[PDB]
Each structure stands twice: as C-alpha cells, then as structure tokens.
Design a protein around this ligand. Structure first.
Ligand SMILES: CCCCCCCCCCCCCCCCCC(=O)OC[C@H](COP(=O)(O)OCCN)OC(=O)CCCCCCCCCCCCCCCCC
Ligand SMILES: CCCCCCCCCCCCCCCCCC(=O)OC[C@H](COP(=O)(O)OCCN)OC(=O)CCCCCCCCCCCCCCCCC
Ligand SMILES: CCCCCCCCCCCCCCCCCC(=O)OC[C@H](COP(=O)(O)OCCN)OC(=O)CCCCCCCCCCCCCCCCC
Ligand SMILES: CCCCCCCCCCCCCCCCCC(=O)OC[C@H](COP(=O)(O)OCCN)OC(=O)CCCCCCCCCCCCCCCCC
Ligand SMILES: CCCCCCCCCCCCCCCCCC(=O)OC[C@H](COP(=O)(O)OCCN)OC(=O)CCCCCCCCCCCCCCCCC
Ligand SMILES: [Cl-]
Lengths: 505, 55, 100, 485
C-alpha cells in the first residue's frame, strides 16, 4: 500500500533537509519542496485510482486502501492506516498547504535552515498520520508528536520582531493547552479499550472493533467528553481558544507553521471520524451544548476579530468564528450539513492561507502588522491590496468563492434539524462583513497613518504571485463547481451520518 | 468590553493558582534541618493517625 | 513474666523522647545524641519482640541495629568535626544556606 | 536455607562487586592510582553485569531466608549496575580536578551498588533494613566528598541526620510488625491474621512507621524537604547515583514487600499511599515551576516521578501490568536521569569548586556544546512524558494501570501534574538554544575519559528515542523479569 509512504516521505525528507545544509544553505528548501511535491503527487494518484465518485456508502468501516503492521503486539497496538473520501481530501489539502509552507519560507536561507525544514516536514508528516491512523494509539501518538516541532518553530524561528520571551510564552501556552487536552483523550481511549475487554474479552485498539462497544449512558458520556476536550482545543471551541491568537502572532512571520500546523482541520475530522461513530448516543445528547458553544464562537470570534489592531490576530479570531459553523453542522446528523462542513474545512484552509501568506509579505515591506500604522496601501502596492480584498470577500462568504457553498450548505441542513440555532447563526454573516471590511478599510483604504505607509513599497514577486493566485483559482473553482469534491466525500460522510442516526434510534 | 478576550483570562486562573501554590509550598523549603526533622515527625503522626481512623 | 505491651511502651517512650531531643536542640552534638536514643529504642523493641516469640532473630536484628548506630555515629561525629574545624559553630540553624 | 554450590551461582553479582570492593581497597593500600582503581571498579561492576546471564540460566531460587533470586532481582540488579558504572564514568573527569584522596569515591560507589543488589534480592525485613543502610552510609561520604565546599558539607549533614532519623522509624516499625507477626519474612507479614482481621492496629502502625523511613528515601511528601538541598549540594557525579540507583533499588524492594506481604492488600495502607502519591505528584511539579537551579529542579522532578510510580503500587493487587509498568517506567527514568544529571556532571568537570547548577549556565549550551544541548532537550522531553520518548511509554503504563484499577483521583493528578510539569521542562529545553553572549563557560577537558561520559549521555538519549517509538523490545525484557510468586 502507498498509505505508509504519505507519512514516511515527509519524515525522510525532513532528515534529508537537515543533512543537505552541508551542500549549502540554499539546498534544504529544494529538498523540502520535492518532499512535499512527491507526497502531493502520491495523494493525487490515490484520488485518480480510488473511484471515490462511484463508491456508494456500504456502511462503516469502508476504506479504499488500508495498511497494517505490528508495532506494539503486547498491547495489540499496530501501525493501522486507512484512506476514505474524507481522509483523502484532507491529505491532498495537507500536501497543497505543505508545498505553499515551503514556498512561503523560500527567502529564508540563514544557518540551521535545515532544522527549520526538518521540523516543517515532520509537522506535515504527523498531520497526514492523524488523517490516516485508525489505531487509537497511533491517532493519539501523531496528535501529540506534531506539537514538538511546532513548539520549536514558534519559539526559535518565530516572529522576527517579537522578543524571545514573548515567543516562548506563546509556544508554552500552545503546547500545554494541546498536549494536556490530548492526554485527556488518551485517558478516554484507555477507558474504551478496558470497557471493551470487560464487555467482550478482546484487547483491541482498532477503531473498527471498538465501533460497537456495549457501554452505559454515563460511561459513554464521560468517554465522549474526553475526546471533545482534545477536539475543542485544536478547533478551537471557545473557551479553549486563547492559545490560537498568540501562536499565530508569534509563529514564523512567513506563515509556514500557520498553514502546516494550524490550518489543517484535524479536530473537525476527529469529531466526524471517532466521536460521532464511537459515541453516537452521547454525541446526540451533547448536541445542544456543542451547537450553542458554536453560536458563541461565531459572535465572540467576530467581535474579538473586529478589535485586534494586529492584522494576523484579526485573521486568527476569524477562524474561531468560522469553525463555530462546522461544530453546529457536525452535531445535526444531516448529510447536507456534513457535506458543507467538508467544503468549509477545505475553503477556510485556502482562504485563511492566502490571508496569512499575504500578511507575511506585507510585513516584509512595511515591517509592521499594526493596522493603526497602515492606510492607503492600495495606492502604494501593485498586487497585495487587491488580492487581500479577494480573500476577505471569500472570508465574509461571497457566493462564488467556495466559502459560501460550505457555509450555506451547513445552514440549509442545520435549519431542517435546529431552526432557531440556524437563524441566530446566519446573523454571523453580518458580523463577518463588519470585521472583513474593517480590516480592508483600516489597512489598504483611507490615508497613510504612518511614514512607512506613505512611500511606494516593493512589488510582489512571481513566486509570491503564483502561490496566492493558485489559492484564488482554487477558491473560485470550489465556488462555481464544488461537485467533484462533494462526490469524493459523499460515501464517507454518508457512512458516518447513517451510523450516527441509526445508532441513536 | 471584550477587547482583551475575557474568556482567555478566565482560563488563565488555573495557572495563576498554580504559581501561587508553588510559592506557598516553597515556603516549607527553608534550609533549616530542625524543621525538616519536625516535618517527618508531623508526617509520622498524620500517617499513623489515618491508619488508625481508616483501620 | 513481663507483658509484651509494657516492653513495647518502654521503647516507644525512649523513641519519642529521642525525637523530641533531635528537634528542640540546635547543637549538632545534642542532635546526634538524640538519634542514638532513637536507634537504641528501636533495637530494644526488637529484643522485646524476639523475647516474646522466643527467637534469636530479635538479638540478630539488635546486632545489625547497633552496627548501624556505630557506623552512623562514626560518620556523624566526623561531619561535626569538619563543621567545627571550618565554622567553629555547631548551631545547625547556620547550616541552612541552600533553600527555596 | 543453606549456601549450596547452586545458590552460590545466584549470588555472582553480589560476590563479584564484594570482591571488587576488597581488591580495589588492597590496590589503594599498595598505591593510590586514580586510573587503575577507577578501571578496576568499572571492570568488577561490568563482570557483575555479565554474571547476570549465568544467574538467569541457573533459574529462580531462594538462597537463604534473607534473599530470593528471580527475574525481578536480575532486572533491578542490572538497573543498579548500569546506574553505577555511569556514576564511575562521570566521576573520573570530575575527580581529576579534586586535589585530594579520590580512590575512596569508587570504593564507596561499589559498596552502595552492593546495597542495591541486596535490596533487589531482599525477601526478608533484615535484608530490607541492611540494603538501605548499605546504599545510604556510603552516600553520606559521597554527598560530602567535597567537604571543603560549604554546600557539600551542608548536604552531607542534612542527609546523614535525616537518613539516621528515617532508619530509626524504619527499625521501630519493623520491630512492631515483628511483635505481631513473629516472622521477619515478607510472606509472613499479615499471614497470622484471620479473615477480616488483617487491619491489626500494631501491624498497621509498624507499616506506618516503616513508610516514614521508605517515603524519605523515595522523596515522597511529606518526607521530601531534603531532596532539593541534597541534590544541589552533592557533587554532580554523586547526584546522578542518588537520583537513580538509590530510588530504583528502594522502590523495587517496596514493590516486592507490598506484593509478597499479605497485609499489602490493606485498604488503610492503600488509601494512605494514595494521599502520598497525589500530594507527591502535585507538590513536586508546583515547587519546580519557579526553580532557577537545574539540580533543585531535578530534585522536585524526582518527587513527582516517584509519585507517578506509587500509582502502579496502589494498583498492584488489582492487575498484573503493575510490575511491568514499574520496570518500564524505571528503565526510562534511569536513561532520562543519567542523561540530564550526566550533562550537569560533564559541565561541572573537572572539579573547580561550585558545580554548574544555575539554569543561566545552560542558556546557550548549543552554541558551545551542541551534542550536550541536544541530549538535555531529549531528556527534558522524556522527563515531561512527551510521545516519541521512553518517558511517555512509562506514563502510558501508569495511566493504563490506574484506569484498569479505577484510580480516578490519581489518574486526574497525573494529567494535572504532567500539564504543570510541561511548563518548566520546556523552559529548560528551549533555553539551551537561546543566545547567551556572556561566556563564563569553562573549556571542556580533552581526555577519552571525559569523552566516554559524553558517549554515555548520547547512548542514553538514543535509547530514550528508539524505545520511545519502538518500545516492544523493552516491554518483552521487563515482562520476562517477573517476581517468583
Ligand atoms: C477540563 C477543563 C477544560 C478543558 C481543558 C483543555 C486543556 C487546557 C489546558 C490548559 C489549561 C489552562 C492553562 C492556562 C495557562 C496557559 C499557559 C500556561 O500554562 O502558563 C502560561 C503562563 C505565562 O507566563 P510565562 O510563561 O512566565 O510568560 C511570562 C509572563 N507572562 O506561564 C506561567 O507563568 C504559568 C505557570 C504554570 C504553568 C503550568 C500550570 C498551568 C496549568 C495547570 C493545569 C490545568 C489543568 C489541566 C488539566 C489537563 C487538561 C484538561
Ligand atoms: C467546553 C466543552 C466541554 C463542556 C463540558 C460540560 C458538559 C456538561 C454536560 C452535562 O452536565 O451533561 C449532563 C447530562 C448528560 O450526562 P450524564 O452522563 O447523563 O450526566 C453526568 C455527566 N457528567 O445532560 C444534561 O443534564 C445537560 C444539561 C446541561 C448541563 C450542562 C451545561 C453546560 C454548559 C456549559 C458548557 C461549557
Ligand atoms: C445577534 C444578532 C441578532 C440575532 C437575532 C436572532 C433572532 C432569532 C429568531 C428566531 C425565530 C424562531 C421562530 O420564530 O420560531 C422558529 C421558526 C419555526 O420553526 P420550524 O421548526 O420551522 O416550525 C415548524 C415547521 N417546520 O423558525 C422559522 O422557520 C422562522 C424563520 C425566519 C426567522 C426570522 C427571524 C427574524 C424575524 C423578524 C424579521
Ligand atoms: C553466552 C555466555 C557468554 C555471554 C554472557 C552474557 C553477555 C551479556 C551479559 C549482560 C546481560 C545479561 C542478561 C541476561 C538475560 C537473560 C537471562 C536468562 O537466562 O534468561 C532466561 C531466564 C530464565 O531461564 P531459565 O530459568 O533457565 O528458564 C527455564 C525455562 N523452562 O529468564 C530471566 O531470568 C529473565 C531475564 C531478563 C530480565 C532481567 C534482565 C536483567 C539484565 C538487564 C537489566 C537492565 C534492564 C533494562 C535494559 C534496557 C536496555 C535498552
Ligand atoms: C484533567 C482531566 C483528568 C481526567 C481524569 C478522569 C476523569 C473521569 C473520571 C471518571 C470516574 C468514574 C465515573 C464512573 C463511575 C465509576 C466507574 C463505573 O461505574 O464504571 C466504570 C466503567 C465500567 O466498568 P465497571 O462498571 O467498573 O465494571 C463492570 C462493567 N460492566 O469502566 C471505566 O473505567 C469507565 C469509567 C468512566 C469513564 C472514564 C474515562 C473518562 C475520560 C475523561 C473524561 C474527561 C471529561 C469528563
Ligand atoms: Cl559536545
């Protein structure tokens, strides 16, 4: 199977990136690009050979490919990997964002750049493993391993303007939030493994076997909450979001960590792949609380974004507001909302990526991220201001940008299940418009509010233009023709939706 | 009102309490050995007392 | 015949007296003297127990205990000498530089 | 039992280390020779490690009423011998700068190792009492080897007085247990009690007074106030042994005692042990949160790690993974501790007076000692329990044993304690790659003996990472090392 190589190539390339700095400080970047290019090519090959569009839901579990190798036999833990329309779509996004993460940090050719790329490649290897792992321990291991590289990238290669103290403070907060939450999930994985043994007599960590574990209402609820705590920190779900704005602000200014370790939806997939299938009844009775937490994140994130001054922290809070819609959808039991969640998870990744990459490029010219020191940048630059407007139009969810397809599909499906929550949630589209236009008016429109913004700035390079324009084409195509993506995730999302509904009944 | 993310400050209480508790516990770390000996005396009484009330 | 309980209480009284001595005295010498009372009291208890069970094990444990007391007092008084030679002061409260 | 030729084979490790203590002493008598005497010590300790093969082939057997040789004994004997060979490799570079008698250091390391091997095979209260004193009295001199240093003398006086007090509580407790039992063997402690009569007041009181002594040696609250002061004052080579050999040797005999002793399954003792574990897990991490001395930080860290291990002891009479968990955890703690303390030793060698203990000394280690910074990072991640490190596999075992035993308060403490711990461990790790323009750092020695210490901390880091990703090899070995029940 090739599934194992979607995780190995990134890891092997990371080692090569470090061992090739001896041939020059301009070599590691090419090794990283080839590494991510090969993983992306392999992902596309799997897409063109799986016939996902013609796969009909046969019921969980339903994998197009699977690999199993003994890892820790004593505990029945193995390297079990499996692909599906949902997982495939998340792996190809990781490959695309990984190539862009390498291209964005291309002018960074300082010493120890090999270790930078090693950490970047390993963050991506872990993310791909999280989307492929079907062994509960492998899932947890990949969930927690990807955090160590991220910690050192935010603390040692973080915002060039921030002091070491501020960067470390942010990295520690991110790690403690995430590793501790992940540990609460291990406690629940271990409890599920023991409840299975006691109820049946088998010792397994395989998701396929633990899918129907006879358990009481109380234990199922506690086990479900344990997984949710881990998926609430990475989504994020308010009030476990404080770590996000800080990490984004102190992360490599170029935007590499932002795209690789913060824009891949490993928590939304986790809620759809494990929480909903493993604990169907508990998820159904927690739906009200989860959906209301999402509504709060929609308005709280929007208000927090409006008052940010820092452009990168503004974009960071917009993510909390947008992910609230996905949380509401995951707990509706509607195929339309689930399919829309998949589109939004992909669209937000592309729209947020563009904003984060453009933010880094802007810093390279004005050496500031404070919007109070910008203004009239539309008349001082050649592309950045116009392209930032596009990504903000997509962020507010303009029809024709792909973010609209996901957001409206979620609302249409959610309305059929929870009408009142859908009505209040739709008003979030007005708040989005407020923060989206606020950022454009406070940075590119009006008059220069500082001297640096009052001089013609260097123009965007071909590399910068290519990566940003690629994201523009993808968002527009996803907005006008989203069917090819919907046809790939239909079987997987159908299996999950049926399981949840049928199990609750 | 929300400009400073109030809910984040609320989730920072677990860390303010931790630092405070650490400083209070370190107050028992006075280099005085006679106190260290008294600490073991107090511990012995507590352990033996609990063993008798939980017997 | 002596009640086993009476013998064990004698040892307990000498043990608690020795401990009180180790905590109330600031002089390293009186602290080392207090420890000798405590270890002698523990050895006495073993002899009382071995006598109640009519076994030589009580006296065997006493021999191991007095061997430790001999070795511990030897090393203990050596450190007292070093402290006196360098600081000419046996107040243990002064030996408290490392803290926090 | 008597000493048969077969029983003598099971004693090879104890006999070889004992002969080394004599030959090395006769060598010092003939002529003081730092190199030869250190070499003779290492050769004897290695011979003992190799003899473990012959002991295993012979099979489990009770040599006398005081010792039982089995897989558990072999495993803990190996652990103490490894931690002791490392202590010697770390001492030579340091003792090179010590302008005084240095051969006695190795003589004391050998006698302390003999204490750990006895504690590994101990099946009787006499063996337990003697093994602790054989691993403590030599350490009084090792903790105060640099008596001319004020901190080393303070550390020695503190350990000696407190250890002596702890030995009296232990003996008095054992005496009270004997008064009720009539037999000093572990299997007889609680055997004479009838059904529902296990909680005999005096038997529980004896164990309680014994716990004061054992808890002190294992740095468990409320007998832990000595750890930070002694760990900091003791010479760095010694701190490595005190943090590894003593703790592993004493924790192992406690496991065998609570396993063989019928009274071990007392709820009162279990509930008391549980309070100690909870406090140790929380207090240790909270007190290390603001430490600016690496030695004191690693001291408070030991308090929490031993608290995590106690959870497996509390879940001993409920599962079988309890013994396996402690083996795997202690193996990881050994390599992780030898790595961190060993790097401190190498950065404090040769002896020039005070040791490099301030975290400021390590604020740019990578830009001077690259491999040493990398090792320290790996060990800091291992001691934090971060997946990809052996330390995590040990934590996984503890959490699994706890969940199967429904120790929910304790499992919750391990999570909160680990979260608190991540703050200080990561701080020390990231500090190594920061830039400290100030360079008061001393130049590294250039002898193969110093380079050997660097290899020890490097191999220990490689093991922590290889076994952190592939732990089945270690799990298989520890599973073979099971007590003779
Ligand atoms: C079930 C609950 C709901 C779900 C929870 C999901 C997981 C949440 C995990 C995080 C919990 C809240 C943590 C809040 C603080 C986050 C950052 C942190 O730990 O400390 C940051 C703080 C900043 O200060 P400093 O680093 O010194 O920088 C210079 C001065 N500003 O540094 C400090 O000075 C603080 C020093 C102590 C840091 C460690 C102790 C704080 C956390 C203790 C454990 C809390 C409970 C976690 C339990 C597991 C997860 C549920
Ligand atoms: C942050 C994300 C994590 C939220 C954690 C809090 C969820 C609380 C859920 C709850 O209390 O549900 C209780 C009950 C269903 O759970 P059951 O097992 O029946 O009762 C024992 C639950 N420990 O169901 C109920 O009775 C639910 C009624 C509402 C009670 C909880 C409201 C929580 C609101 C704040 C959430 C944050
Ligand atoms: C923060 C920013 C402002 C937020 C404002 C939020 C307003 C929320 C208003 C909720 C109204 C709900 C209501 O009227 O009841 C639910 C209603 C009918 O629900 P349904 O289940 O469809 O009825 C049975 C047939 N299916 O649901 C519906 O179908 C009604 C849909 C239209 C709702 C219009 C709300 C505004 C009305 C004034 C203009
Ligand atoms: C060929 C001769 C020349 C070479 C000599 C050997 C060279 C190397 C010497 C150093 C290492 C020695 C280790 C020996 C382990 C094997 C011992 C053995 O015999 O294993 C089998 C033994 C049971 O044997 P037996 O009773 O005969 O079986 C009857 C079955 N019906 O079962 C046991 O006793 C279990 C043994 C395994 C558990 C204890 C291991 C102790 C040693 C390691 C300590 C450290 C552990 C951590 C290491 C981490 C490494 C990454
Ligand atoms: C900082 C975070 C720290 C987190 C620490 C742990 C928090 C949760 C603590 C839960 C305490 C137990 C609650 C249930 C009552 C006692 C257990 C019980 O009655 O059943 C235990 C369950 C089934 O097995 P049992 O009933 O013992 O045996 C017969 C089986 N027919 O078998 C079990 O083992 C299941 C027990 C319930 C689920 C435990 C796992 C929860 C995962 C974390 C949730 C966090 C959010 C809440
Ligand atoms: Cl080096």
């Amino acid at each position: 199977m090739l599934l194992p190589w979607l995780i190995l190539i990134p890891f092997i390339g990371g080692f090569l990136c470090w061992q090739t700095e001896r041939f020059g400080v301009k070599v590691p970047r090419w090794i990283a690009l080839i590494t991510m290019g090969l993983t992306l090519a392999l992902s596309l090959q799997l897409w063109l050979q799986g016939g996902y569009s013609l796969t009909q839901s046969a019921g969980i579990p339903q994998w197009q490919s699977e690999f199993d190798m003994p890892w820790i036999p004593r505990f029945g833990i193995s390297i079990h990997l499996a692909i599906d329309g949902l997982s495939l779509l998340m792996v190809v996004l990781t490959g695309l964002l990984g190539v862009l993460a390498v291209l964005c940090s291309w002018k960074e050719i300082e010493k120890y750049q090999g270790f930078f790329h090693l950490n970047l490649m390993w963050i991506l290897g872990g993310v791909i493993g999280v989307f492929l792992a079907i062994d509960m321990f492998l899932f947890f291991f990949f969930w927690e391993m990807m955090l160590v590289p991220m910690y050192f990238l935010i603390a040692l290669w973080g915002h060039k303007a921030s002091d070491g103290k501020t960067r470390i403070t942010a990295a520690t907060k991110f790690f403690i939030y995430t590793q501790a939450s992940g540990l609460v999930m291990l406690i629940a994985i271990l409890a599920l493994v023991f409840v299975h043994y006691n109820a049946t007599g088998v010792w397994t960590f395989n998701y396929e076997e633990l899918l129907n574990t006879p358990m009481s209402s109380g234990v199922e609820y506690l086990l479900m909450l344990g997984f949710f705590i881990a998926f609430a920190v990475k989504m994020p779900v308010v009030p476990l979001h404080g770590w996000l704005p800080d990490a984004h602000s102190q992360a490599p200014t170029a935007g590499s960590v932002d795209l690789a370790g913060i824009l891949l939806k490993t928590a939304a997939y986790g809620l759809l792949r494990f929480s909903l299938p493993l604990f169907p009844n508990a998820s159904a009775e927690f739906a009200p609380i989860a959906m209301w937490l999402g509504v709060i994140g929609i308005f709280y994130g929007a208000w927090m974004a409006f008052a940010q001054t820092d452009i990168k922290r503004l974009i960071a809070y917009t993510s909390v507001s947008h992910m609230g819609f996905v949380l509401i959808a995951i707990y509706t039991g509607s195929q339309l909302a689930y399919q829309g969640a998949v589109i939004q998870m992909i669209a937000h990744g592309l729209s947020a990526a563009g904003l984060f990459i453009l933010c880094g490029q802007l810093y390279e010219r004005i050496h500031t991220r404070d919007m109070r020191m910008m203004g009239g940048l539309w008349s001082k630059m050649k592309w950045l201001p116009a392209l930032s407007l596009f990504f903000a139009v997509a962020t507010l969810g303009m029809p024709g940008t792909g973010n609209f397809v996901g957001e409206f599909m979620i609302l249409f499906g959610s309305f059929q299940v929870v009408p009142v929550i859908t009505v209040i949630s739709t008003f979030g589209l007005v708040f989005a418009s407020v923060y989206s236009l606020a950022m454009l008016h406070r940075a590119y429109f009006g008059k220069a509010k500082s001297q640096i913004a009052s001089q013609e700035l260097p123009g965007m390079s071909l590399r910068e233009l290519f990566m940003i324009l690629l994201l523009v084409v993808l968002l527009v195509l996803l907005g006008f023709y989203p069917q090819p993506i919907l046809d790939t995730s239909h079987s997987a999302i159908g299996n999950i939706q049926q399981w949840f509904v049928n199990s609750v009944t | 009102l929300l400009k400073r993310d109030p809910l984040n400050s609320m989730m920072n209480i677990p860390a303010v309490l931790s630092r405070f508790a650490g400083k209070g516990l370190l107050l028992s770390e006075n280099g005085y050995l006679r106190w260290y000996v008294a600490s073991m005396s107090i511990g012995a009484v507590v352990v033996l007392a609990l063993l008798m009330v939980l017997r | 015949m002596i009640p086993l309980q009476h013998g064990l209480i004698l040892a307990a009284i000498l043990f608690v007296l020795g401990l009180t001595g180790l905590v109330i005295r600031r002089n390293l010498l009186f602290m080392l003297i207090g420890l000798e009372i405590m270890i002698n009291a523990s050895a006495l208890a073993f002899v009382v127990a071995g006598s109640y069970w009519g076994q030589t094990d009580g006296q065997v444990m006493y021999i191991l205990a007095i061997s430790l007391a001999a070795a511990e007092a030897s090393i203990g008084l050596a450190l007292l000498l070093q402290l006196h030679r360098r600081r000419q002061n046996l107040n243990i409260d002064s030996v408290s530089e490392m803290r926090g | 039992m008597t000493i048969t030729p077969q029983n003598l084979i099971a004693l090879l490790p104890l006999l070889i280390v004992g002969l080394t203590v004599v030959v090395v002493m006769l060598s010092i008598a003939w002529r003081r020779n730092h190199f030869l005497n250190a070499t003779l010590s290492v050769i004897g300790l290695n011979a003992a490690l190799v003899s473990l093969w012959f002991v295993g082939q012979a099979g489990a057997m009770d040599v006398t009423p005081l010792m039982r040789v089995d897989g558990f004994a072999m495993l803990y004997t190996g652990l103490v011998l490894l931690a002791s060979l490392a202590t010697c490799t770390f001492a030579y570079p340091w003792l090179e700068g010590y302008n005084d008698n240095k051969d006695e250091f190795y003589l004391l390391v050998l006698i302390a190792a003999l204490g750990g091997i006895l504690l590994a095979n101990a099946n009787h209260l006499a063996s337990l009492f003697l093994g602790i004193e054989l691993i403590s009295l030599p350490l009084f001199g090792l903790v105060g080897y640099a008596f001319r240093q004020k901190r080393s003398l303070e550390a020695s006086i503190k350990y000696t007085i407190l250890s002596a007090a702890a030995s009296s509580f232990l003996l008095f407790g054992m005496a009270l247990v004997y008064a009720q039992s009539g037999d000093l063997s572990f299997v007889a402690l609680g055997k004479n009690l009838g059904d529902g009569m296990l909680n005999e007041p005096l038997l529980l009181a004896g164990f309680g007074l014994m716990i004061v002594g054992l808890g002190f040696k294992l740095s468990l609250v409320p007998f832990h106030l000595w750890t930070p002061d002694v760990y900091q004052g003791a010479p760095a080579p010694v701190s490595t042994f005190l943090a590894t050999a003593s703790k592993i040797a004493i924790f192992g005999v406690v496991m065998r005692l609570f396993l063989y002793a019928p009274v071990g399954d007392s709820e009162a003792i279990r509930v008391v042990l549980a309070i100690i574990a909870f406090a140790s897990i929380i207090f240790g991490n909270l007190m290390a949160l603001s430490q600016t001395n690496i030695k004191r930080l690693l001291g408070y860290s030991s308090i929490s790690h031993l608290g995590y291990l106690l959870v497996a002891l509390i879940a001993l009479q409920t599962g079988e993974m309890s013994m396996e968990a402690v083996g795997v955890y202690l193996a990881g703690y050994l390599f992780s501790s030898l790595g961190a303390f060993g790097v401190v030793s190498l950065m404090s060698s040769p002896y020039r007076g005070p040791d490099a203990d301030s975290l400021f000394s390590y604020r740019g280690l990578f830009w001077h000692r690259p491999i040493l910074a990398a090792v320290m990072t790996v060990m800091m991640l291992s001691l934090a329990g971060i997946p990809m490190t052996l330390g995590f596999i040990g934590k996984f075992y503890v959490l699994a044993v706890g969940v199967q035993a429904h120790l929910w308060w304790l499992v919750g403490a391990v999570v909160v304690g680990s979260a608190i711990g991540l703050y200080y461990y990561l701080r020390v790790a990231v500090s190594l790659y920061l830039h400290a323009p100030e360079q008061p750092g001393r130049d590294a020695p250039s002898n193969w003996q110093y380079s050997a210490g660097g290899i020890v901390v490097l191999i220990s880091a490689l093991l922590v990472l290889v076994l952190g990703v592939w732990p089945q090899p270690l799990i298989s070995i520890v599973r073979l090392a099971m007590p003779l029940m």
